[PDB]
Amino acid sequence: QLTAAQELMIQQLVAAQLQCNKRSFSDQPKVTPWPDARQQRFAHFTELAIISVQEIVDFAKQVPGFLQLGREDQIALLKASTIEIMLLETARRYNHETECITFLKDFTYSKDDFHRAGLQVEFINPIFEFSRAMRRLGLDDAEYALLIAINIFSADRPNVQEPGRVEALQQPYVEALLSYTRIKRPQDQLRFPRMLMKLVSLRTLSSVHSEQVFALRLQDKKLPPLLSEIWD
Amino acid sequence: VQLTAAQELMIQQLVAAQLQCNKRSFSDQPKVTPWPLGADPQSRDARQQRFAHFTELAIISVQEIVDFAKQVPGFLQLGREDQIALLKASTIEIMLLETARRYNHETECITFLKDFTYSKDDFHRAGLQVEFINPIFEFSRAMRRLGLDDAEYALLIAINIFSADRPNVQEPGRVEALQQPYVEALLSYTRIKRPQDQLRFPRMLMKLVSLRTLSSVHSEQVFALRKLPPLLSEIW
Numbered sequence: 088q089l090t091a092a093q094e095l096m097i098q099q100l101v102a103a104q105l106q107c108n109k110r111s112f113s114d115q116p117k118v119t120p121w122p123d124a125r126q127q128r129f130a131h132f133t134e135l136a137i138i139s140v141q142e143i144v145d146f147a148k149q150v151p152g153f154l155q156l157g158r159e160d161q162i163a164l165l166k167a168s169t170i171e172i173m174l175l176e177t178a179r180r181y182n183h184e185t186e187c188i189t190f191l192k193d194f195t196y197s198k199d200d201f202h203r204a205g206l207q208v209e210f211i212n213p214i215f216e217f218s219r220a221m222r223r224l225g226l227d228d229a230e231y232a233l234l235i236a237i238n239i240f241s242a243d244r245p246n247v248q249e250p251g252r253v254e255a256l257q258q259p260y261v262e263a264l265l266s267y268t269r270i271k272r273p274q275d276q277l278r279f280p281r282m283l284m285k286l287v288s289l290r291t292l293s294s295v296h297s298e299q300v301f302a303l304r305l306q307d308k309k310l311p312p313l314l315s316e317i318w319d
Numbered sequence: 320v321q322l323t324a325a326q327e328l329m330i331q332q333l334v335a336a337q338l339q340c341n342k343r344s345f346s347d348q349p350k351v352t353p354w355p356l357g358a359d360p361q362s363r364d365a366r367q368q369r370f371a372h373f374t375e376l377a378i379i380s381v382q383e384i385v386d387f388a389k390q391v392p393g394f395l396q397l398g399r400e401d402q403i404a405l406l407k408a409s410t411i412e413i414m415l416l417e418t419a420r421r422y423n424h425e426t427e428c429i430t431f432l433k434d435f436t437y438s439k440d441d442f443h444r445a446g447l448q449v450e451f452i453n454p455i456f457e458f459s460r461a462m463r464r465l466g467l468d469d470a471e472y473a474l475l476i477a478i479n480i481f482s483a484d485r486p487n488v489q490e491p492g493r494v495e496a497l498q499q500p501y502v503e504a505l506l507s508y509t510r511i512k513r514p515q516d517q518l519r520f521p522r523m524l525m526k527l528v529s530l531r532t533l534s535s536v537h538s539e540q541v542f543a544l545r546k547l548p549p550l551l552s553e554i555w
């Protein structure tokens with residue numbers, strides 16, 4: 088059974104996830120409308136990424152223990168995980184019946200909509216493959232929030248000054264996930280390792296993204312200062 | 320809490336295959352270019368000999384990796400194209416895992432084959448990069464603190480071979496299916512090895528995560544090359 092201390096920690100994760108998502112709903116009319124059609128779509132996805140960076144920063148701040156790390160390590164952790172949390176979050180917002188992704192909470196996008204924005208098949212295909220594989224695991228809101236916390240507290244990230252402290256903070260989240268999964272599916276048991284293995288997939292996805300970041304140097308419109316920095 | 324007969328025989332099979340692979344490679348010990356000793360410490364010929372020797376040790380590793388894989392239950396069940404795709408993508412991760420297994424924390428030296436022993440500086444003196452030499456040593460030190468045995472390494476290697484997400488895999492569903500008995504067997508083995516820990520298993524599995532980043536950084540593209548970011552600092 089789950090420990091009361093573990094439940095508290097999870098309750099805080101789910102509340103922060105719900106608060107940050109809700110905070111971004113009001114941005115729906117503020118984003119450039121979906122239809123040069125290609126450029127407008129590219130600028131639309133760009134604005135959506137900017138908002139996602141905000142939610143991630145805002146959520147991480149609410150993760151128990153994140154605020155006790157040094158300021159330099161906090162930023163270093165957030166720099167390397169932003170792409171991976173965006174991917175994790177994309178998967179949570181993926182519907183396999185319609186085969187579509189819900190951004191904000193009304194805005195629906197299909198595989199072809201990303202292709203029509205000038206994004207390469209080299210990157211869009213793995214995104215949808217990852218979303219489908221995540222869907223089969225049947226994660227709930229708590230399981231994603233836990234997985235995102237584990238991802239944030241990665242000690243091997245570049246420019247991390249106190250990796251021992253980062254690693255020690257990841258421990259309760261892995262523990263809570265182990266406990267949470269054992270109660271939800273007592274007869275599976277392979278489900279928990281299958282979740283952790285998705286963190287391995289995320290490493291490759293981030294690496295594929297860094298190679299696809301090259302294709303963006305070709306189009307005349309440059310990425311906003313924020314996005315251009317986090318990704319290159 | 321005891322291993323199943325299917326688990327015990329597989330682990331034995333895996334450790335047996337791991338042994339005969341290393342065994343066969345020791346025959347090549349006098350065949351490879353000798354490690355230069357007594358030369359001028361600034362010698363070009365010596366640095367080129369050191370380099371050609373490490374190149375040869377890597378060539379032996381590859382053949383050993385292929386021989387071991389062919390003996391992993393289910394690997395030969397896959398199509399030849401997936402077998403190649405899986406081995407192309409995992410070779411470097413297996414080399415690194417195998418290096419950590421051969422690392423000694425008392426001497427701080429790595430044993431290639433079973434006689435040759437090299438320190439951090441020995442890799443530097445062969446002109447190997449050091450962007451990559453330091454990460455090799457720190458991965459080896461991290462793996463030592465997990466205190467893995469030969470069974471746990473063979474199991475982690477099998478789990479690594481069967482990754483559905485590798486480039487050019489045509490049947491990822493089957494690859495992912497074949498990974499499961501090795502994940503199961505590792506869970507049971509760690510459960511019996513350290514019944515009070517329970518975190519040792521997820522920590523082990525987590526080393527595949529950092530291992531995936533180590534591999535990407537070794538083969539990173541010149542067009543994809545990557546202080547505090549000012550804009551992200553402003554958002555806090």
Ligand SMILES: CC(C)(O)c1cn(-c2ccc(-c3cccc(S(C)(=O)=O)c3)cc2)c(C(C)(C)c2ccccc2Cl)n1
Nearest residue numbers: 111129132133135136138139173174176177190191206
């Ligand atoms: C290169 C370019 C145009 O600037 C760009 C931006 N994005 C993008 C990145 C992240 C997101 C996103 C992820 C999670 C949630 C949200 S949201 C709108 O707060 O619900 C948006 C949306 C789009 C993306 C794509 C679509 C490729 C992407 C989607 C999912 C995850 C990562 C990336 Cl890079 N490309």
Ligand SMILES: CC(C)(O)c1cn(-c2ccc(-c3cccc(S(C)(=O)=O)c3)cc2)c(C(C)(C)c2ccccc2Cl)n1
Nearest residue numbers: 344373374376377379380383414415417418431432447
């Ligand atoms: C490209 C270059 C310069 O020829 C090269 C080769 N290697 C290398 C690769 C693999 C190995 C190796 C790993 C495990 C076992 C063995 S063995 C069969 O016991 O000699 C060799 C040794 C050296 C390496 C280094 C030393 C950097 C390396 C070490 C460990 C893992 C990978 C690599 Cl690339 N660089």
